[PDB]
C-alpha cells in the first residue's frame, strides 16, 4: 500500500490477540506500546521524546501483525501517548518513505 | 527518492540561508526546529509527545528547502531534541509511506 501523510498514518496492529491502533513513525527508533501486559523476560530502559524521557520495559522477539505483515521483534511498553511503530519494525515490513 | 529506514532519515534542510540537519518524521503533525531566529510575527504554542510538552514559537509561511524541494509553511521553533520535519511539510515535498 501507499499511505498519504495528510492525516496521521494510523494502522491496526494485532499483538497477543489484542487489536490496537498504532502510528507508523519514521521519527522513532523503536516501537513503543501503551502500558499492557506481555509475557516473559524484560529489561528496563529509558527512552527520549520531544518532551523529555520515559521509563519503559523492553520485551524481545515479540510477534505482531502490522497491516497483514507478520513481524517478530523488540517492543517497548510504557506511558507513550499513542502506540508507535518505529523503524525497528517498519524495516521488517519493507516500509520506505517515498517522494 | 525512496528513503529506507535502516538508519534515522536525516536530511539537510536550508532555511534563511542556513544549512541544518533534520529528521523526516511521519509521527509528527508539525515541523519543529531547534532555537533560531526567524523573521516576522509569531505565536506561542504548546506541543506534546513522548515525555510531555514543550513551549514553542509558531511562525507562518516560512520558506524552507528540503532535499532540494522548495516548500513554504508553518515552522515551530523551540527546545526539540532534534530538528523535525513533520507532516505539514512532508506532504508538500510529496512524501508517502510505501510497503
Amino acid at each position: 500500500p501507499q499511505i498519504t501523510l495528510w492525516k496521521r498514518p494510523l494502522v491496526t496492529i494485532r499483538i497477543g490477540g489484542q487489536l490496537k491502533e498504532a502510528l507508523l513513525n519514521t521519527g522513532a527508533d523503536d516501537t513503543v506500546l501503551e502500558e499492557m501486559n506481555l509475557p516473559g523476560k524484560w529489561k528496563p530502559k529509558m527512552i527520549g521524546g520531544v518532551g523529555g524521557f520515559i521509563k519503559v520495559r523492553q520485551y524481545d522477539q515479540i510477534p505482531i501483525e502490522i497491516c497483514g505483515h507478520k513481524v517478530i521483534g523488540t517492543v517497548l511498553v510504557g506511558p507513550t501517548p499513542v502506540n508507535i511503530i518505529g523503524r525497528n519494525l517498519l524495516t521488517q515490513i519493507g516500509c520506505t518513505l517515498n517522494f | 527518492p525512496q528513503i529506507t529506514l535502516w538508519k534515522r532519515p536525516l536530511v539537510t534542510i536550508r532555511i534563511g540561508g542556513q544549512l541544518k540537519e533534520a529528521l523526516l518524521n511521519t509521527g509528527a503533525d508539525d515541523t519543529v526546529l531547534e532555537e533560531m531566529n526567524l523573521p516576522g510575527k509569531w505565536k506561542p504554542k504548546m506541543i506534546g509527545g513522548v515525555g510531555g510538552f514543550i513551549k514553542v514559537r509558531q511562525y507562518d509561511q516560512i520558506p524552507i528547502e528540503i532535499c532540494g524541494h522548495k516548500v513554504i509553511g508553518t515552522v515551530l521553533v523551540g527546545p526539540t531534541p532534534v530538528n523535525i520535519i513533520g507532516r505539514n511539510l512532508l506532504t508538500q515535498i510529496g512524501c508517502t509511506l510505501n510497503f
Partner: peptide, 10 residues
C-alpha cells in the same frame, strides 16, 4: 492531543 512522537533509543 499531543502531536510530535519523535522517539530516541537509550
Amino acid at each position: 492531543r499531543p502531536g510530535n512522537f519523535f522517539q530516541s533509543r537509550p
